[PDB]
Amino acid sequence: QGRKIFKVFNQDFIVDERYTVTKELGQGAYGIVCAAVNNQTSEGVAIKKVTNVFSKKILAKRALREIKLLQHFRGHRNITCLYDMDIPRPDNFNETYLYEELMECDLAAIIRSGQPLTDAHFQSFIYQILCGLKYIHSANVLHRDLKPGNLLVNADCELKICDFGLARGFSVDPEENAGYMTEYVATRWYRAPEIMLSFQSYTKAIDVWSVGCILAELLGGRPFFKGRDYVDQLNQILHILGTPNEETLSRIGSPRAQEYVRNLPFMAKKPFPTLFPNANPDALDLLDRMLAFDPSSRISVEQALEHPYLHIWHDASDEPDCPTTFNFDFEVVEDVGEMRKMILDEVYRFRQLVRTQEYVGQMNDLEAELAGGLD
Ligand SMILES: CNC(=O)[C@H](Cc1c[nH]c2ccccc12)NC(=O)c1ccc2cncc(-c3cc(OC(F)(F)F)ccc3OC)c2n1
Structure with missing residues (x-):
């Protein structure tokens, strides 16, 4: 046995x-x-x-x-x-x-506990998420359901991404990208708006959006876009980010949705400093860039890693890519x-x-030569 x-x-x-x-x-x-x-x-x-x-x-x-x-x-x-x-x-x-x-806790539990978190904690958490996300994305995989609940945390406040059950392929080739399978729906509060709005631009930006929702949730201590259904989720996003411009409007590939958004009263963007007036200004700048309504204006994972908010943590030599891309052929x-x-x-x-050149090498080489010279 x-x-x-x-x-x-x-x-x-x-x-x-x-x-x-x-x-x-x-x-x-x-x-x-x-x-x-x-x-x-x-x-x-x-x-x-x-x-x-x-x-x-x-x-x-x-x-x-x-x-x-x-x-x-x-x-x-x-x-x-x-x-x-x-x-x-x-x-x-x-x-x-x-x-x-x-892993002992998850980030949802830490936020629920109300235990005090410093701006340095926020930086550490976001940095770690983005490092893991850079690795995943470099394999052409979208995590697709990032949220505080799948961000596992130990007593040292070290953070690890979990739960690949909803992950999805990504390809720069539009025909391939459209064929990747999506069996389950991601978590509504954290799901990127271009998905419910049928942008048909399924891109790496969908995960960056979720990271932005997580940063917003850390800054306020509660979920930022807390929609009870998709209409409500949309209304909450627009109430913060404001009426999008004509170009963004026209990318809404769903006719009822486009009609609905176009007819709403004008809504001014609510600047993040007014919503989090005690926050680090660099945190809000990165937040603004991660929660760009339109994916095409949303910051990339690599740019976010280079943002001044994370400059203490950023060490590109310490942010590896995955050696190979992941093959989704099985899902057919x-x-x-x-x-x-x-x-x-x-x-x-x-x-x-x-169940299965360095200094020392240079000196080991030189030593071998000096011993095996003459004679
Ligand atoms: C939100 N998303 C998930 O929580 C998936 C759920 C999931 C994906 N595949 C599955 C297959 C069978 C059962 C569950 C899953 N968890 C994992 O990926 C997973 C990975 C490494 C873990 C290492 N240490 C602890 C946990 C953990 C598990 C818990 O139990 C739960 F049930 F997971 F909540 C509750 C809290 C935990 O840590 C604080 C871990 N959790």
Whole structure:
């Protein structure tokens, strides 16, 4: 066997025998998560039981998407690192276990706690997000659902992005970009306006917008655009950013939406200094650029990393790109039996994988020559 069975969330939770489940962390539409310790090494881990994987084609597609994306993005300081995967009952398996780097809080909880945060905390959080996002984007992946809840934080206030279940491909080739699959809808409060407005310009700017909403939420201590539905969300965005210009207006590819926006009364932009009069002016300038209504005017991740607000943190030599782009060919598979086969392949291949000039060099070279000279 080699495994232990725990009872959590009123169901079986079957883990590697090296681990002891310590604590229930949460449950969502896709499974349940517990914290655990490696009893030998005392290392902590989050164990995620992805549940009912083959109950719906959509659940199996999401599981396979998360499994592959998590592997692609291991080894970044600001991204939750996948350590292991396991399928304890492979005969008729309807679940997969992912073993991920454990994190004590999330940014939504920290903001909820009301604990005091300094402008330096805000800078650190935004910087870390953008570093992780630069890595993800450099692989031509859009996270697509960034929000305080998926930004995990430990006691050192170190921050890591999690949850690739809704991520989406991106391509500069319009035909390819339009074919990338989007099974689930992202979180309304944080979703970029060009999406509900059918700009058809699905771009990396959609994530930058979410980062802006997060910065705004840090500055005010509460969600910035808190729409109860999409009409309400639109009205709240426009009430802050104001009537867009004719060019932006004409990019609204949805006729009811364009009609609605065009007929609204004039609305002046509400300047962010009036809304956050105690904030650092550099924070509000970067906020203004991240919450540009029109994606074409929105700051890019790399420009944001170079913004004066983050100049203390910015070290381009310390902001790596991902070595390769991620391949989304799998998402054309529509047969669940084949998705099962592919998930087994992913898990077994990953399991074997994880179980496998400078001054000194110049002087070592010179030393070897000086010893092996004459004679
Ligand atoms: C908002 N988005 C998510 O929270 C997804 C949800 C998700 C994506 N795929 C899944 C498959 C099965 C079950 C859940 C998921 N969490 C993760 O990606 C994930 C990654 C590394 C983690 C490392 N340490 C802790 C957690 C954690 C889990 C919790 O439990 C919950 F249930 F996740 F809330 C609650 C708080 C936590 O940290 C403070 C972690 N969480």
